[PDB]
């Protein structure tokens, strides 16, 4: 049949919830992360968003990088849907990955290696704009490594709270060559600066493996995509990658 | 004869003391700028440290960008010498601050742009690495903006506190084209990332301005100067620009 999953990727920030009947068009809902929560909470909070589709969910599969998180997830998905969720983790098999310890790898980089794998090819390079921004190697199939940078939001919050003079500035590009105010020159190092940090990155990269296609993600991609050259934007691309890690 | 004159640049994190008899040569020391410290716990600080040279100061010199520690170097400069301070401030003379609201520009990159235009010349770009890392811009003498970027510890320490996951690295630059763990990843996304997104700026600064010379500067700068091309390192530009302005 179709039967109907339910993907999660809970990160720092946000958690994504998305339904799938056939792992390539998926309906999508973001809900804050937020400490404490229980499974009834979760529940509450699904109830108005999915409506009738909540009784047809068969399978739960998450990636997770909040661990105190995971308990509320299966206490959801045992009460509610009888279920255990099946949990995205490094493992030999599609995906070989040469590094030092692919069990410390987040979840949320394993599953877009192992959906850019599946949907897009063996060699990619994969930004992933959240909450941090994180770059990943796949070549010939092999998950390689690559760089954690603070996200963009986070950039700015840390100027805010670690200074006594500098403001909370709303995460926008900068479209001038140097500030002439304190906006400005946030917004030009912190966004404009974390985008030339990235070419850095993915040019050394390339440098060495050559040419590889860049695909771009990540819930603060949307804003600065025109300023980074990628051959693929796939805002879906971690629920993919769960979606087909635990349901094939 | 020379008189001897004690310069202050107070910091986020760190306050830095410096005494100079003829603006030439500086002897320093470096405190943390610490919360609700007083006029006479920053005395018995300097007292072991400064030793006989305390009772020959004849003027403080004062670059601050954290307002409430003012009152308390206030308090000690009128305590301990009967002087007040001398403030450094965007104001008219050797610098045309081109910029749109002067007065917010912080005291220690008026400094930095004061000692420049004294030292080195009329054209030059400036990176200062502090708790945030600053660009600014001067071209004929007239200081055009800039860029502030998150600095190094604050970078890291932002990933350790708003994620789960994360530690906190140490700031080590990566020898690596990609990280094969968790604590390489992040020391190539925020070291060599951050050289990465200093050396963007720089380049489309210079591709509207001309070829100006690089000064570097700031705490966390020496770890990397040798990853940053620069003409100039020195490492007492602020303290510099404190006694330039109060002292001539
Ligand atoms: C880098 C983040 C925070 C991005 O969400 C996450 O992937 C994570 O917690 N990773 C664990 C460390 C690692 O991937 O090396
Ligand atoms: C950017 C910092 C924090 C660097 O120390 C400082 O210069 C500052 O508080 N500046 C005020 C904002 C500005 O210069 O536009």
Chains 1, 2 share one sequence.
């Not at 937020?34 to 499974?39: A, P, Y």
């Not at 949320?108 to 930004?127: H, L």
Request: aromatic share 10%.
């Amino acid at each position: 049949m179709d039967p109907m999953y339910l993907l999660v990727d809970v990160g720092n920030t946000h958690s994504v919830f998305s339904i799938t009947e056939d792992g390539k068009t998926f309906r999508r809902w973001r809900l804050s992360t937020g400490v404490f929560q229980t499974e009834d909470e979760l529940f509450s909070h699904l109830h108005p968003l999915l409506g009738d589709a909540m009784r047809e969910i068969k399978g739960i599969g998450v990636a997770s990088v909040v661990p105190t998180q995971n308990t509320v997830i299966e206490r959801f998905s045992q009460k509610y849907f009888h279920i255990s969720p099946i949990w995205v983790k490094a493992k030999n098999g599609c995906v070989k990955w040469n590094v030092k310890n692919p069990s410390e790898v987040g979840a949320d980089r394993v599953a877009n290696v192992v959906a850019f794998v599946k949907e897009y090819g063996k060699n990619g390079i994969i930004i992933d704009m959240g909450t941090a921004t994180t770059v990943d190697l796949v070549v010939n199939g092999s998950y390689e490594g690559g760089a954690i940078l603070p996200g963009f939001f986070m950039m700015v919050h840390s100027l805010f709270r670690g200074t006594a003079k500098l403001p909370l500035v709303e995460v926008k590009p900068a479209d001038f060559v140097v500030g002439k105010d304190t906006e400005e020159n946030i917004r030009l190092g912190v966004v404009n600066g974390s985008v030339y940090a990235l070419e850095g990155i993915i040019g050394r990269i390339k440098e060495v493996y050559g040419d590889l296609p860049v695909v771009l993600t990540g819930g603060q991609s949307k804003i600065v995509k025109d300023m980074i050259k990628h051959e693929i934007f796939d805002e879906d691309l971690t629920i993919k990658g769960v979606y087909h890690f635990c349901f094939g």
